[PDB]
Amino acid sequence: PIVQNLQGQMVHQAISPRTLNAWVKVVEEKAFSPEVIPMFSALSAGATPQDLNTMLNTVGGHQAAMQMLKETINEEAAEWDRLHPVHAGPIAPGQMREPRGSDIAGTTSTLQEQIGWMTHNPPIPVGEIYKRWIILGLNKIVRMYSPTSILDIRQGPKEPFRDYVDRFYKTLRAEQASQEVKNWMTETLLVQNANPDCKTILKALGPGATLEEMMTACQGV
Amino acid sequence: PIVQNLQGQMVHQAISPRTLNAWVKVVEEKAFSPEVIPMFSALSAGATPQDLNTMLNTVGGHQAAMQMLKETINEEAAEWDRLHPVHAGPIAPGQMREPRGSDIAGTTSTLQEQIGWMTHNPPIPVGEIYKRWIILGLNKIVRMYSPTSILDIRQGPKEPFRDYVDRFYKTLRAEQASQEVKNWMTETLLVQNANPDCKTILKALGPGATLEEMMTACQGV
Amino acid sequence: PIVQNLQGQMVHQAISPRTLNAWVKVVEEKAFSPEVIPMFSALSAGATPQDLNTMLNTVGGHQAAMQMLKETINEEAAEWDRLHPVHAGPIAPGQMREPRGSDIAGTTSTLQEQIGWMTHNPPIPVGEIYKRWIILGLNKIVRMYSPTSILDIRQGPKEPFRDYVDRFYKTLRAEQASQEVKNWMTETLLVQNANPDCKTILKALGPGATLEEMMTACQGV
Amino acid sequence: PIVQNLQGQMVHQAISPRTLNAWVKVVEEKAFSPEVIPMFSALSAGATPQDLNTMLNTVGGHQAAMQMLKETINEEAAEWDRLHPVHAGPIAPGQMREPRGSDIAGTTSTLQEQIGWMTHNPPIPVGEIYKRWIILGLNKIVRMYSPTSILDIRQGPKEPFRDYVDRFYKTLRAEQASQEVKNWMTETLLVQNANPDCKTILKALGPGATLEEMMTACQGV
Amino acid sequence: PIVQNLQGQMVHQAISPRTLNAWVKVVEEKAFSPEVIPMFSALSAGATPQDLNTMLNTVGGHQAAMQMLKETINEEAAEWDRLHPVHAGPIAPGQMREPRGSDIAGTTSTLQEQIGWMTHNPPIPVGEIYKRWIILGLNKIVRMYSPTSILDIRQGPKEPFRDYVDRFYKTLRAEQASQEVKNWMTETLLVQNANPDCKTILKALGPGATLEEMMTACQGV
Amino acid sequence: PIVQNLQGQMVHQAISPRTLNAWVKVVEEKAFSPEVIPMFSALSAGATPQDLNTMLNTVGGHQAAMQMLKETINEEAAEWDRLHPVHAGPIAPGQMREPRGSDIAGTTSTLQEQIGWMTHNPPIPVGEIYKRWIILGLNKIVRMYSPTSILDIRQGPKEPFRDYVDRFYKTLRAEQASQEVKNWMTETLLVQNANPDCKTILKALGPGATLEEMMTACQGV
Ligand SMILES: [Cl-]
Ligand SMILES: [Cl-]
Ligand SMILES: [Cl-]
Ligand SMILES: [Cl-]
Ligand SMILES: [Cl-]
Ligand SMILES: [Cl-]
Ligand SMILES: [Cl-]
Ligand SMILES: [Cl-]
Ligand SMILES: [Cl-]
Ligand SMILES: [Cl-]
Ligand SMILES: [Cl-]
Ligand SMILES: [Cl-]
Ligand SMILES: [Cl-]
Ligand SMILES: [Cl-]
Ligand SMILES: [Cl-]
Ligand SMILES: [Cl-]
Ligand SMILES: [Cl-]
Ligand SMILES: [Cl-]
Ligand SMILES: [Cl-]
Ligand SMILES: [Cl-]
Ligand SMILES: [Cl-]
Ligand SMILES: [Cl-]
Ligand SMILES: [Cl-]
Ligand SMILES: [Cl-]
Ligand SMILES: [Cl-]
Ligand SMILES: [Cl-]
Ligand SMILES: [Cl-]
Ligand SMILES: [Cl-]
Ligand SMILES: [Cl-]
Ligand SMILES: [Cl-]
Ligand SMILES: [Cl-]
Ligand SMILES: [Cl-]
Ligand SMILES: [Cl-]
Ligand SMILES: [Cl-]
Ligand SMILES: [Cl-]
Ligand SMILES: [Cl-]
Ligand SMILES: [Cl-]
Ligand SMILES: [Cl-]
Ligand SMILES: [Cl-]
Ligand SMILES: [Cl-]
Ligand SMILES: [Cl-]
Ligand SMILES: [Cl-]
Ligand SMILES: [Cl-]
Ligand SMILES: [Cl-]
Ligand SMILES: [Cl-]
Ligand SMILES: [Cl-]
Ligand SMILES: [Cl-]
Ligand SMILES: [Cl-]
Ligand SMILES: [Cl-]
Ligand SMILES: [Cl-]
Ligand SMILES: [Cl-]
Ligand SMILES: [Cl-]
Ligand SMILES: [Cl-]
Ligand SMILES: [Cl-]
Ligand SMILES: [Cl-]
Ligand SMILES: [Cl-]
Ligand SMILES: [Cl-]
Ligand SMILES: [Cl-]
Ligand SMILES: [Cl-]
Ligand SMILES: [Cl-]
Ligand SMILES: [Cl-]
Ligand SMILES: [Cl-]
Ligand SMILES: [Cl-]
Ligand SMILES: [Cl-]
Ligand SMILES: [Cl-]
Ligand SMILES: [Cl-]
Ligand SMILES: [Cl-]
Ligand SMILES: [Cl-]
Ligand SMILES: [Cl-]
Ligand SMILES: [Cl-]
Ligand SMILES: [Cl-]
Ligand SMILES: [Cl-]
């Protein structure tokens, strides 16, 4: 993170050991469940590309996902260099240079250069752009490591409707279904995969029924 | 949360890992017991709509309640757009725009826009309004997931009166009974569902008896 | 709690998750032992009526004691309204209004109104008065939930005198005995309920003996 | 504790939940071992008489020692009132009054009065004086609860000399032996209670031998 | 670490017990796994050579690696003295002297001298240079303590392809393979060491296939 | 520790409960292993003689080492009084007096006197000098409590060379061997106490071999 110096400068704030161990423990415990991506977005608030690389390098194991994530960063950095070409002549002494793709990734850039980009006015949010690339690669890792398909999420003859709905939207979240995909799935597959007794209840509920109405109705079955 | 910059600005304060792990652990341990709603109100003091969405997205599992909560937010945001219509012409450069329903929800708004709304004078408390919508949806989830009805809360022939009163008001709290409903329930059902020996004691106590008098009297049975 | 803003205002300070979980854990572990009341007085130092209601609402279970505590707050708020009647005409725009009983309880008052009362000069300590009502109700709950009477605290024929004195004053504290009641109980019941050998030792010690002299003398028996 | 307000006042700083739970846990775990008295002196650095009473009242159990400690405070407060008599006429409006014995104890004094005494120039260190009374009573409790006499600390025929010296000075510390008492005990009883083989080694070491020389010599036996 | 004094000086900030115990616990738990080197780089952000020596000396055990690390520091300090020779005449009173190799190591230098070097303008980053020597020695220790060769990382006939890729890049990271070495290893050895069914799938995928394409294809085998 | 007051004074900063419990737990767990001495040097950064005495007095047990440590402090304080004699006439009102040996030890000096010595210009570092005496006594305690001699550290016929080197330098550290003693021991005893197969490998390696070369060579045996 970046914090303002008491004299006036903008200095880099080290990652607290609390944030470090919290990150390595939620990865050790929950692996690549969907909820660890917003947790990574929370523990990396205001971080620089060097801070982001620090959090990612402290991960033990999961090196297959780390190399996949590194390939996604390289692709996004290449697209950035295509969209933001540099007229790189001789360097200007003491002036802010335009960041390349690898500069946003924090590999070919220094902590001072990253601070100067993020604290500029207008700021070049190299930390937020890099963080957006990491979220993109993490979404691909979570989707790939999704165990079950939505076709195999069917309510058992004695499973409570709320528990089957739990597995339903848990699978939809792992498969990176957007909110509209979840809405259309609520109108169709959720009713069509409920057990016979609940399915007749959900059909008699009528179209346009909300999730509160569907779960309250099938509470008795 | 929002904190004042030492130079003068109003900057966003990141959620501490302590607050994050405290929230995900009380949800993992207590699920949707009534006491986790005031705990959510405590851990989200002064938070922005982006901070609130961060706390809600870090929840693992319970995706049925999350989609229900998302439906309640959509309904309240639609009622807000009906009560506060916008005369949305061309945008004013560098000026504060009127927040829509989805802007209060933190989806179609940015962290800077939320800060500007909350730090304005008079403030547009988008964080408190969004937080009020979340409390409303959480109350519906707790009420739906209430296991027992108040009819099945009856004092056993050897259960202490205080323990039966514990289950009594615990069930009333889960079923979202207001304070007047609990007062009228104390005058009627609490006596009518006590075991025979305690019931005769509570009847001889006379009307208008307080809970201290009722629990002290049936202490011997 | 209330903390001074760096610009000059008096702003509300959110309850730390450390204070929250410390409160819910000492209630989960020790229930209504006498020592949890001073702990509640320590964890609620400088709190507002809204902060106090937050700590009390985060308690899981014990709803019988919570409703008893709520009845005691209502009684004390009614006595306050009798002792401090309001000449409530039309409201004065932008001026501090006189707090009623429910305003001290934090139900009919807002966080801004509570801050203005507590930060006034002279301050209207609505937080300390409300906290004094809560301590009063908590004392009634601890006294009611006291298991043993002082008559059944008698030194066994092989129990060390210090352990019997432990149970003695532990029972006296639960039954809300004041310091003079404990002093007179030390002169009388403590000697009269010691086992025969210690009782003869305590009688030969002479009147006006201190607790250090009584426990050192019966150390051999 | 007392901390300086940013505007200029001297305000009371609440006891952190870390300090509270640390105190109640070292008392729960170690009871009245000698090392808990310096720990109490460390966790109560700069505390007011109200903070000290808060830490002492949060102790669960050990009510026999608490009443003994309360008797010692009363004795020291009575000796203070004898050494510092007050010419208590009518009170001076807005002026600092002379603290009595019970005012130092924090019972007949308020937090504001204690702050004014401690922050005066020259300060009336009511917190340090009260803390000195508490240390005096705690020393009497630790000495009374000392299990073994120094006569029964004798080196076994196969116990390492360092372990017997451990029990030796551990017993001397519990019995409140000063440093000179420990020095004279090192010259005499420590050698006279070592097992025969070590005792002959310690005698041949010569007089005026240090503890390093005594423990290094008997390392082989 | 170094922090600015409120008056104006640059003072040394002590290592927090959180950072200390976090370092000694990740060494106790994970030994010399690759991820503990970036963790050491994170917990030592902004540290002085004295702070670095403190963190390294608090390590219990692993004294073989500690002496190896000490030999690597001596070699790098000797190369520094060769690249930066000093014209060491008489000392200049009150002036900053040129740091030698052992001065960067923090052995022949004091905390004040290290602060003056790091807080100078331009700064002599003795902490970052020393930290770079430590990372170099730690890399040699991790590489030496690597258990398996990449030749013995072969996918079992029933091991999921992602798990074999996990062991593959985990071994490559332990053997200090750079990113290009990992890229060329992905093109060659990763396919040539997959089990027969996956190997035929990876060959039919075509050249230039990414890790996401390789792991998604062999998901069925 | 000492911290600067916001008004301008230099005030004593209380030891945090984190630092206290961290010290008493590393002593409870690791006793007098060599690594607890640098840990004590880290947890006592910037401490006063009163803070140092507080940390040492909170130690439960190990009273044999505590009395040995107290004898070493007395010897060093006597040598200080010999090297720095005082011309102690009448005291100068309001002036800084020269510290004696017991004043550095923190027994015959007050917290205010210690602060004035440490915050003077030039400072009288009574805390660092006392801390240097404590490190000296702790080194004697660790050396005395060293279990094994270096003669009994011999590589087993099936022990990995790195593990035997671990026990080798672990024993050398406990016996307070300096770095040159460890270097000469690496050239001689380390090879002469390796098992026959490794010993022939280390002899064929040639003289002047480094620890990295010795451990990499004997990796196969
Ligand atoms: Cl920087
Ligand atoms: Cl941590
Ligand atoms: Cl999120
Ligand atoms: Cl790395
Ligand atoms: Cl750009
Ligand atoms: Cl940009
Ligand atoms: Cl995706
Ligand atoms: Cl069933
Ligand atoms: Cl599932
Ligand atoms: Cl259907
Ligand atoms: Cl259901
Ligand atoms: Cl159900
Ligand atoms: Cl912002
Ligand atoms: Cl945390
Ligand atoms: Cl609440
Ligand atoms: Cl999400
Ligand atoms: Cl509006
Ligand atoms: Cl509004
Ligand atoms: Cl509801
Ligand atoms: Cl029974
Ligand atoms: Cl129930
Ligand atoms: Cl009835
Ligand atoms: Cl009862
Ligand atoms: Cl009962
Ligand atoms: Cl406010
Ligand atoms: Cl917490
Ligand atoms: Cl109290
Ligand atoms: Cl509530
Ligand atoms: Cl009033
Ligand atoms: Cl008032
Ligand atoms: Cl009472
Ligand atoms: Cl017995
Ligand atoms: Cl009892
Ligand atoms: Cl009698
Ligand atoms: Cl006894
Ligand atoms: Cl006894
Ligand atoms: Cl105050
Ligand atoms: Cl705590
Ligand atoms: Cl002490
Ligand atoms: Cl009390
Ligand atoms: Cl006085
Ligand atoms: Cl005085
Ligand atoms: Cl004593
Ligand atoms: Cl033996
Ligand atoms: Cl003992
Ligand atoms: Cl003798
Ligand atoms: Cl021994
Ligand atoms: Cl021994
Ligand atoms: Cl310094
Ligand atoms: Cl710690
Ligand atoms: Cl890194
Ligand atoms: Cl060391
Ligand atoms: Cl240089
Ligand atoms: Cl340089
Ligand atoms: Cl390497
Ligand atoms: Cl299988
Ligand atoms: Cl492996
Ligand atoms: Cl091939
Ligand atoms: Cl796979
Ligand atoms: Cl698979
Ligand atoms: Cl002071
Ligand atoms: Cl602690
Ligand atoms: Cl060190
Ligand atoms: Cl002591
Ligand atoms: Cl001097
Ligand atoms: Cl000096
Ligand atoms: Cl030594
Ligand atoms: Cl073997
Ligand atoms: Cl060993
Ligand atoms: Cl040889
Ligand atoms: Cl080896
Ligand atoms: Cl090996």
Numbering used by the authors:
A (entry chain A), B (entry chain A), C (entry chain A), D (entry chain A), E (entry chain A), F (entry chain A): 1 to 221
Published text:
During maturation of human immunodeficiency virus type 1 (HIV-1), capsid proteins (CA) assemble into a conical core (or capsid) surrounding the viral genome. Formation of a core with optimal stability is a strict requirement for efficient HIV-1 infection. CA folds into two distinct domains connected by a linker: the N-terminal domain (CANTD), composed of seven α-helices and a single β-hairpin, and the C-terminal domain (CACTD), composed of a 310-helix and four α-helices. The cores comprise ~250 CA hexamers and 12 CA pentamers.
While E45A also crystallizes in space group P6 as P38A and P38A/T216I, surprisingly, we obtained data from crystals with two different unit cell dimensions: a = b = 87.6 Å, c = 56.5 Å (resolution 2.5 Å, labeled E45Aa) and a = b = 92.5 Å, c = 57.8 Å (resolution 2.2 Å, labeled E45Ab). The ~5% difference in the unit cell dimensions between E45Aa and E45Ab is explained by the repositioning of the loop between helices α8 and α9 (~3 Å movement) in E45Aa. This important movement primarily affects interactions at the 2-fold interface between neighboring hexamers; specifically, between helix α9 from one hexamer (α9_hex1) and the same α9 helix from the neighboring hexamer (α9_hex2). As a result, the hexamers in E45Aa arrange more tightly than in WT CA or E45Ab, forming extended interactions at the 2-fold and 3-fold CACTD-CACTD inter-hexamer interfaces that are distant from the location of mutation. Interface area calculations reveal that E45Aa has ~160% (726.2 vs. 453.2 Å2) and ~510% (236.4 vs. 46.3 Å2) more buried surface than WT CA at the 2-fold and 3-fold, respectively. Notably, a novel inter-hexamer interface is formed in E45Aa between N-terminal domains along the 3-fold symmetry axis (IA 23.9 Å2) mediated by R82 of the E45Aa CANTDs and a H2O molecule (6 H2O per hexamer). Thus, the enhanced buried surface area and inter-subunit interactions observed in E45Aa may contribute to a “tighter” structure of E45Aa, further stabilized by CANTD-CANTD interactions at the 3-fold inter-hexamer interface, potentially contributing to the hyper-stabilization effect observed for HIV-1 E45A cores. Surprisingly, comparison of the E45Aa and E45Ab structures with resolved β-hairpins revealed that they assume two distinct conformations that differ by ~11 Å (as measured by the displacement of the Q7 Cα): ‘open’ in the E45Aa, and ‘closed’ in the E45Ab. In the E45Aa where β-hairpin assumes ‘open’ conformation, D51 maintains interaction with P1 and now adds a second salt-bridge interaction with H12 (in yellow). Most importantly, the unique interactions between the α9_hex1 and α9_hex2 helices from neighboring hexamers in the E45Aa structure, directly affect access to the common binding site of PF74, Nup153, and CPSF6.
